[PDB]
Design a protein around this ligand. Structure first.
Ligand SMILES: O=C(O)c1ccccc1O
Ligand SMILES: O=C(O)c1ccccc1O
Lengths: 139, 139
């Protein structure tokens, strides 16, 4: 059966199952999926471009732009000009956004620890290294 | 930076980048993303439930049901009753659907081979085994 060992299908199913588990927690804490992805991706970051944010959150750029409109209205993020090119808008999390998401981020780390514990440290680090290398080759 | 090593973010980005590459090919062959996922997931399968199809194609069940309405109208799939429980509808690919997708499936196998070749057979099989185990634990 073709799909049983087809890498893109395996990645898509694993990603959906793992992320959907945490989504229930995020909503119980008042976050939508996309709000969580944006704030988690900006936490601890220097300002990044809207395009970079769209890539890392796996969200279409027009969707991200509308999302940032409302999150900036709520004081959770800030958009800023690029210091050279003004094709580029940069975005950062605010202190208000960080305080809003830090507890959820701890719960996310615990969730990931539970997901990876059956595989052991070696298999977990191998998985993360392979995924990171794949991203950097394909982005 | 939290997101750089957060497993769900790594899985989601890797899956998006790898699948989006093949999507351009699928569309050039007349398939939408969801049509491709359905036909690839049914190819070589015994009939499966609509819920199973929704899980493996990572598509919401109401979306899958509308998709099957039109794909069955086009003679590419067939819905059938479960031989015991009639809460359950089963679905299979037809010969017409298989012939429609088999060339695309060969191109998909070549694409996967290219994606995995830099990692080698050992790292590739490790990745697939880990993803399969994760799916089976979380489904
Ligand atoms: O990403 C794919 O190409 C795919 C194909 C079949 C089933 C699920 C999938 O994600
Ligand atoms: O799936 C997640 O939880 C996630 C979080 C941050 C960025 C991208 C993501 O897919």
């Amino acid at each position: 059966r073709f799909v049983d060992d087809y890498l893109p299908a395996l990645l898509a199913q694993a990603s959906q199952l793992i992320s959907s588990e945490f989504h229930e927690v995020a909503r119980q804490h008042g976050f939508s999926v996309s709000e969580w992805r944006v704030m988690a991706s900006l936490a601890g970051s220097e300002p990044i471009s809207i395009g970079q944010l769209a890539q890392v959150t796996v969200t279409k750029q027009p969707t991200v732009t509308r999302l940032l409109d409302r999150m900036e209205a709520r004081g959770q993020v800030e958009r800023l000009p690029h210091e050279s090119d003004r094709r580029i808008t940069l975005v950062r999390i605010t202190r208000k956004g960080l305080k809003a998401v830090e507890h959820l981020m701890e719960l996310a780390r615990e969730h990931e620890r539970r997901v990876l514990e059956p595989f052991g440290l070696r298999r977990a680090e191998e998985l993360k290294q392979t995924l990171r290398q794949m991203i950097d080759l394909h982005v």
